[model samples]
Target chain A: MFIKNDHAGDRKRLEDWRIKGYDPLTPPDLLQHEFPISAKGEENIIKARDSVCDILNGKDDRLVIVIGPCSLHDPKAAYDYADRLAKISEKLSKDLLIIMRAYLEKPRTTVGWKGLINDPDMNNSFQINKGLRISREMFIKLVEKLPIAGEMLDTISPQFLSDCFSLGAIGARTTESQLHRELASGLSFPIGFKNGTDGGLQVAIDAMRAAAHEHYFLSVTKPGVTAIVGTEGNKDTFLILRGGKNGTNFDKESVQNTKKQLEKAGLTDDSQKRIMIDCSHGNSNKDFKNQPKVAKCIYDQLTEGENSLCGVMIESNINEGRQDIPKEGGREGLKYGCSVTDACIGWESTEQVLELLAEGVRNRRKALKK
Target chain B: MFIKNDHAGDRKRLEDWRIKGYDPLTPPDLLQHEFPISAKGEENIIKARDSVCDILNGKDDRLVIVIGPCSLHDPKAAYDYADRLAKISEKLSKDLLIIMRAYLEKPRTTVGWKGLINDPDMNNSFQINKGLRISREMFIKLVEKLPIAGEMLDTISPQFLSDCFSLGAIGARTTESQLHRELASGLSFPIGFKNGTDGGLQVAIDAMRAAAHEHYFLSVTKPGVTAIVGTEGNKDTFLILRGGKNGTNFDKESVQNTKKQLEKAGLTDDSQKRIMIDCSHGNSNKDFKNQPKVAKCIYDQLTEGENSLCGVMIESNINEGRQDIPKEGGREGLKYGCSVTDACIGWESTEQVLELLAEGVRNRRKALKK
Candidate 1:
């Protein structure tokens, strides 16, 4: 048996025991000032957000497509993908709302490289301040002509970078976390709560309801002070069924089951209460090649009158598949345009999948007229 | 205004809200069984541990030097470093006990690439299970001839790999974290608690005391079940002065102050309580070139009768400094041997520093005899 420390000692231990130090960060306000988004960029972000919300709410028939590299490890590659994506987004505007997945943070199963924002150098030395500056600069540059989608991981990071993201996701690892739910509640854009990694939809369904309700929590303010953050609940929350341990949930049966669950949870009143299918993770069985197959399944269902399925998420990059960061050569051993995180479909495959999805949406619109 | 959920609902939300999913890990027992360390490797591990203990306990007169790369990104490069280090270890056995820093998990200031054990693929698809197997296989092979050192980040990871490590460290970020203190208490080897990133030593001092006592906490068992872990407490805890916010603590005043603080805390009764200096991080002002200067200062102190300075740590690799992982080419763009994380002194500088330290140790021994 052991005894606890005295009150004074206990307080001191609690305050400093686990803290190494606090390096000051470039606050959100300063970051925005240094790399402010252009007026056109701001207008595009608002327009994209409104369009996606309109589609989810049944006011628009266009299908929302969230597609990009699984994770952005290189800024130049990201811009290349963005430039290509922006052109396609413009052409597909009538029937599809395409949002580039400009994800910066990645949730790990246990641990690994976190993302470019944490280590801009991609080496393990965490120069977070440097990462922040670089990420902001890139985000500003990328979002100039495209709506960027970002994964909200840490609650505090949004303060510095959230304004640049037109769409946000509470990732699979964090869908169950109240902190993330609270974060989603306060976010400016419509947020997607991903199903648990084990393929449970209840967690995400629960997250949607929670995010729709107001909450108070401790958070860092714009100037970086720790304060009580009160959120006015965002109702623009939806589900992203990414498939999990039980396996791919992108099939008809899973979609139907999810619709019923959403209805049961009282989310089917005025809004379309839509669900988006993620064509990666367990749905693709963690294979890049299977993404198109999963996309085709979702497209087929949409064409077959699955009105509740409003969107699809695809992991695609300029190059197909992933290459190992060479053990002997480090970064010098990688291929350009390929994913360094999740293996992804190449540019040509991505174009084909989008064309098919757009056709499916066209068919859905035609059937609705009857 | 929003009312909170009912107690039961709140309890459920609190319990599971923050979890995304529990991806099954290969139970530690199974992992160890699959990649079991050889009997000879186990012997070397024990011998290395014992030798370090002897130095700390004053039973051995030779200094202990913990040296290696900032982080292990490539197994092949790691093996190459180990092959060279092992040769040097044998040649310098009489004058110094050398422990190769085999860090697998890196604690990020915020987030980025974690380390090899988190992403064996280096591309962020986080194949943790694959990382574990690879790390174990590498650890087993490397420790066959030389002892290894690891940085303890996640408490649960140790169950699968702790037996292979002769030395462990509680990083600066988590020195104040109670969870880490609890972890340090249960670690198998002598653990060094690094000063806070801002450079405060009191947190480490407090940790040293806290880690020396028994505690119970939640942890996953080797069989992969979550259980209450009871620790017998680890007495082999010491301080690592790595400098911090105010500046380098490797100066004479800072070292003398540390010794006084240790004496005041009643940890000075034995030779085992001496502090170690790290010639990296803030002490070198995050500059790899400054490492030699820091090492030279410590060596001079040791020669001038600074007996309380028991050891030193150096971050070194085959190449000097570091190169950013190219945003355009990914791994194919990185320079060979250079660190992707912290900048490190090259092989030539590393060899010269070691020779100087060995000479310093020889002089210290001769002076004691006189």
Candidate 2:
């Protein structure tokens, strides 16, 4: 009955910001001036995007390896991971589309710390402006150095980093949101929507159908103005088979069954196959140690000539297992570079898994070329 | 994946309590004990349920009135509401079945304060046990005075307050959650599922049908132990017409339209009438002031001898308008009894509107008797 004044206040803020002369700048422009991704780093992003796209389009036939820390709670650990992944990525470039999983944001099912971008201090001090700045800087840094894939929970996140990301993912929690799917329809990069945590695939199929169509909806412009956003439906959208509560679905039947469902639902077209297997989450039963085992299973599938397998998403960090965030007074006791959120495979384990996946892809290539 | 034994320390704490002979209660039992509705309250719930069922069965003809707070952020306000509602409900007891809205939990699209039961302090101090206790006590207190109804967000919340509630609601945010639907199916009380925020009725209908079937699922027992829950579907499952992005559907046409849709979907049965009407949210254009107008419209229809309408839900509180939660230590500045979440009609307006609704129902009864 009553029009909330807060909505009006927000609109005014948007207008005031616009009146003050807001500037829309790319990652390099803002990052270089404030926190830049260097020239070499930008080149790496372009190469990574192309490589990933090639694999997804079935041109390269390389196994797409998205490996990185479970979350970027600490920038230092994320940087260290990038350094190691950069080195390994180069060696495996021929057989794998090496994209680091740089998830600066994490979505909680009920409640907890939202993500690094919502609370970078690991304390409740949600300096969101600062978090936004830091998040943008981190992505710019990664895009410049490597071809990276980032999953964003908030629909507004893409406004800041969409130009830099080669691949985008809608997490399991938000897979069913129409607004998020609508947001995905307008995204430039190929987007992947995860199945719901309860192991339902209908929602993902629904999201794909929704995302594959043009939508005119409410959105914040790059200049931070509330504007109508019209999307032409990014047909490059696909599904990620993150294991749900029922169990992991990376087995042959799951993949084939999912593929059949998508086809029956008309989600897959002649140009795009909508199926990406996520080897973490339900697949690994949320156990970091099981990631490699799941990845190996996926790799074995590729070796056995399962061409329908689109890509694999892995949760890795500079540390093998997760560490708890030090309580406000216990910072000195905290472990470095380990996730305080989900469990993750550490740096050495991640390198080993990526190498195994690359080897599998190479074997597939050898057989195909013959 | 490796399962971290971090909770091992926490588990030891639980075991110590168990050794002390903590009463083991299943989730359902805990919910019932927490919200123990009086026999009178249970009778009223059955009356309301039967009234709706009769309308669907072409037997009885009376519109249901669901009125109370948008949420139970403050238990004091909720109790005050129940006391006020009980008097008016008595006045219109023969013409209308008045159920007090006592929503204790909220589901956010992305992230925000969950609810009092999830974070009672409003300061992010998630004292879940304390919140649950508060929720149960409030429900027990309210239902002891009058039959109460509320929406279930988390699948487990119902187990905490099942005994006191005359009616149950599934919110727009989680109507599609299979877990929630499964929980709804097993609920002993009559349950109504709201359409999603974007306003898709199909999912709610789907949920209603799905919840009406037997299913085995995982749930926490009343004693807070994880267990598999199986049940014969509760036959009193229904739908709710809360306004969504599609626009308000509180008019006569909308009511008939929903009934037709329900019939087409094969969801209409002896237990479920057309659907309950929520005179808030998008129906009121998200305006608290407009809720009365919408309610009056529904009132006018009933007065004019409309019988298909099963129920109407309204958001009312002790205070007339809403107050913003201070971002940085301004908690004392809030208006007492005012909504800290959605805008709501205050006590004076609530009384006036309820009287108006009572008059409408009285007119209808007289006309029928004549």
Best by DockQ: 2
Q: Write down the C-alpha DockQ for each prediction.
A: 0.01, 0.02
Candidate 2 regions off by >4 Å? Answer: A1-33, A36-39, A269-273, A330-332, A366-370, B1-370
Cα lDDT tens digits for candidate 2, A1-370:
0111233212111111101111122332243357555667666665665566566666667667677777777776677778778887789777767788878766542234657655666665544456668877777776756778788565545655665577788887556655577678766667888887567787788777777675544444443333334556666677889987665797878888888887788666433445787877788887877888887787777777766566888887777778767555433467888777789887778768888888787766665562
The C-alpha lDDT values of all candidates are 0.73, 0.65
The top-ranked prediction according to lDDT is 1
Candidate 2 reaches a DockQ of 0.02
TM-score of each: 0.51, 0.53
Task: Give the per-residue lDDT of model 1 (tens digit) for B237-309.
Answer: 7789996556889987888899888988866554653688998777898899999998878888778766777
